[PDB]
């Protein structure tokens, strides 16, 4: 739940590449760290070209459509399961109809088009003559059902000598985001184009749905506000309503339909909340699998209720309602393989590692339950990881860091917004209401958080948080919104350790006792003191104890390192002279000090290697 949550610090990249990214993208070290990890190296990686991908079958499919168009063949388009299928059919129906095709959607012909996976057929989609990326060996792009519908319309335009159908990219982007596909490469380019087109969409229904929810150009608004309204219509048996909203040019009719989608989404929300309220209190503890039955539950809402349970629980979840079954899983437990282990009991089933579906006679539920519970018992418990980009910079640099991270957008399945680590004794704490919600400060940075039952923060905390630009009264404030918060604990990261932090007091005691020790030529005061006290002074490559940092690398060592408390070595804590790669140095310094204070051998060792480099 929370005791199976591991925090890890992303590795430091090699300095020459870190520098290359900072230069080629014109950003400081923090943001460059993020870009390096997400594979962004040159300026054109931030803005990939939106191009016509060479998917297998794409050309034949477009040729077929050109024939259908010219010969006036009757085209029927199918795809209404969710936002991805609906936006994809809206693209093909509007697009082909704009070219003079006799096309119509099929909500349950000479050519049949099916979106999201005589009479010729084109199965033009993605999801698990078929046009599909996976058929294209070595193509590293993951377009969705709507993405492929868009590519197909584009392939046809190319054949017809027409320009790229960019006005359809907003519909395509909505389906892409809704499908939760990785937002990189072609998908990143498509989404950037489409998100930009929504405010003045050629499709009045989409523009109106977007305004209704307060759209401001963010992928996250599509994911949490737009797509759910569209999906609710379908989950509730009114997919035609959503499809029609995307096809009409009559603003009044669209306005009315937006009202309808709002009502369907409110219904979905109500049912979902009642199901979760009834189910969440059940069979959850430390069971290897949560398996619940809700005889009269609505099959249209159990999928989300299952994901919500899995999230509160960090366990695979299987729900059965009215003989239909849904599975959400994670970690090393495959959803569909768990169903496979109990397949003799099912009427039918299918799916993948994280989600699966089935049908089954509810009378077999107890048997189904023991079986899947046993399947899950064969595996280690699932664990959640929180990936930390780096230690948060000083307050004075937050605005610039924030503006530099901006280019990473759109955030999504592909590149989640980065999380920074903050550490310290909270101060100026102040509740907000009567529970969880509160605010406090760490090293002058204000952080907002929902304290997991307890309230009152330990004397020292660790925070994984999002750097936020909060506006109010026409003014901006750079703060941190905590996603996770805890008493300091195991922290993953760093390289194979060779340098082991030791408190200055302990180090000096051993040095006075005669332990072979190294004191750097710097801080002549420390050196003088050492000499002026009888320390057994040695060069770093031979002393197993250090009171400071050597100027150049000394590897194949395994040493204990102390800096001080008033030592000059510790004076790597002085504020710099910003802007240039002085900030790279500053990042390394803050890392060194942090890993030193936390006695973290791996991070300190890693940081020390970067330290030798940033000085070469
Ligand atoms: Mg899809």
From Swiss-Prot:
Name its co-factor(s).
Answer: Mg(2+); Mn(2+); Co(2+)
Q: What does the similarity note say?
A: Belongs to the RecJ family.
Keyword Metal-binding part of the UniProt annotation: yes
Q: Which GO terms describe its molecular function?
A: DNA binding; exonuclease activity; metal ion binding
The kind of enzyme this is, by top-level EC class, is: hydrolase
Q: Which UniProt keywords apply?
A: DNA-binding, Exonuclease, Hydrolase, Manganese, Metal-binding, Nuclease
What is the recorded name of this protein? Single-stranded-DNA-specific exonuclease RecJ
The top of its lineage is: Bacteria, Thermotogati, Deinococcota, Deinococci, Thermales
Q: Which Pfam families match?
A: DHH (PF01368), DHHA1 (PF02272), RecJ_C (PF22047), RecJ_OB (PF17768)
Q: Which note does the record give on the cofactor?
A: Requires a divalent cation; Mg(2+) > Mn(2+) > Co(2+). Structures with 1 Mg(2+), or 1 or 2 Mn(2+) were determined; the authors conclude 2 metal ions are required for activity.
Where Mn(2+) 2 is bound, by residue?
A: 84, 116, 126, 179
Q: What does this protein do?
A: Single-stranded-DNA-specific exonuclease acting in a 5' to 3' direction; has no detectable activity on ssRNA.
The EC number on file is: 3.1.-.-
Q: Which organism is it from?
A: Thermus thermophilus (strain ATCC 27634 / DSM 579 / HB8)
User: What is said about its interaction partners and assembly?
Assistant: Monomer. Intact protein binds ss- but not dsDNA.
């Amino acid at each position: 739940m929370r005791d199976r949550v591991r925090w890890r610090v992303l590795s430091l990249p090699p300095l020459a590449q870190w520098r290359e990214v900072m230069a080629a993208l014109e950003v400081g070290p923090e943001a460059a760290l993020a870009y390096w990890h997400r594979g962004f190296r040159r300026k054109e990686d931030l803005d990939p070209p939106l191009a016509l991908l060479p998917l297998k079958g794409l050309r034949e499919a477009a040729a077929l459509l050109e024939e259908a168009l010219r010969q006036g063949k009757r085209i029927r388009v199918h795809g209404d399961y969710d936002a991805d299928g609906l936006t994809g059919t809206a693209i093909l129906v509007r697009g082909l109809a704009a070219l003079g095709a006799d096309v119509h959607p099929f909500i349950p012909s000479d050519l049949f088009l099916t979106v999201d996976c005589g009479v010729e057929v084109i199965v033009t989609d993605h999801h698990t003559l078929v046009v599909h990326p996976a058929l294209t060996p070595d193509l590293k792009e993951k377009p969705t059902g709507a993405g492929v519908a868009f590519l197909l319309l584009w392939a046809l335009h190319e054949r017809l000598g027409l320009p790229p159908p960019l006005e359809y990219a907003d519909l395509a982007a909505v389906g892409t985001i809704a499908d939760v596909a990785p937002l990189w490469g072609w998908n990143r380019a498509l989404v950037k184009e489409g998100l930009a087109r929504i405010p003045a969409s050629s499709w009045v229904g989409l523009r109106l749905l977007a305004e209704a929810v307060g759209y401001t150009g963010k992928a996250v608004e599509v994911a949490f506000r737009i797509a759910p309204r569209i999906n609710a219509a379908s989950r509730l048996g009114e997919a035609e309503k959503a499809l029609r909203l995307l096809l009409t040019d009559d603003a009044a009719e669209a306005q009315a339909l937006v009202g309808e989608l709002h009502r369907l989404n409110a219904r979905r929300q109500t049912l979902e909340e009642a199901m979760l309220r009834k189910l969440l209190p059940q069979a959850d503890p430390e069971a290897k699998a949560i398996v619940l039955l809700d005889p009269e539950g609505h099959p249209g809402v159990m999928g989300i209720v299952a994901s919500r349970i899995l999230e509160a629980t960090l366990r695979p979840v299987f729900l059965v309602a009215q003989g239909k079954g849904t599975v959400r899983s994670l970690a090393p437990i495959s959803a569909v393989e768990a169903l496979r282990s109990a397949e003799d009991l099912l009427l039918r089933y299918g799916g993948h590692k994280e989600a699966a579906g089935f049908a089954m006679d509810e009378a077999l539920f107890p048997a189904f339950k023991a079986r899947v519970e046993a399947y899950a018992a064969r595996f280690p418990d699932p664990v959640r990881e929180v990936a930390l980009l780096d230690l948060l910079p000083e307050p004075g640099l937050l605005p610039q860091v924030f503006r530099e991270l901006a280019l990473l957008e759109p955030y999504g399945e592909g590149n989640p917004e980065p999380l920074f680590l903050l550490f310290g004794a909270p101060e100026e704490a102040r509740r907000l209401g009567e529970g969880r919600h509160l605010a406090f400060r760490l090293k002058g940075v204000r952080v907002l958080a929902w304290k997991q039952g307890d309230l009152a923060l330990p004397p020292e905390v660790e925070v994984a948080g999002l750097l936020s630009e909060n506006a109010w009264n026409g003014h901006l404030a750079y703060e941190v919104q905590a996603v996770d918060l805890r008493k300091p604990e195991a922290l993953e990261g760093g390289i194979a350790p060779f340098a082991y932090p030791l408190p200055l007091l302990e180090a000096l005691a051993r040095a006075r006792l005669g332990e072979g020790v190294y004191v750097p030529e710097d801080n002549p005061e420390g050196l003088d003191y050492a000499w002026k006290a009888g320390f057994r002074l040695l060069p770093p490559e031979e002393a197993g104890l250090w009171l400071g940092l050597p100027p150049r690398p000394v590897l194949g060592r395994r040493v204990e390192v102390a800096l001080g408390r008033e030592a000059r070595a510790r004076l790597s804590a002085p504020p710099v002279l910003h802007t240039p790669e002085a900030r790279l140095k500053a990042l390394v310094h803050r890392r060194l000090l942090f890993a030193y204070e936390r006695r973290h051998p791996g991070l300190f060792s890693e940081a020390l290697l970067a330290y030798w480099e940033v000085n070469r």
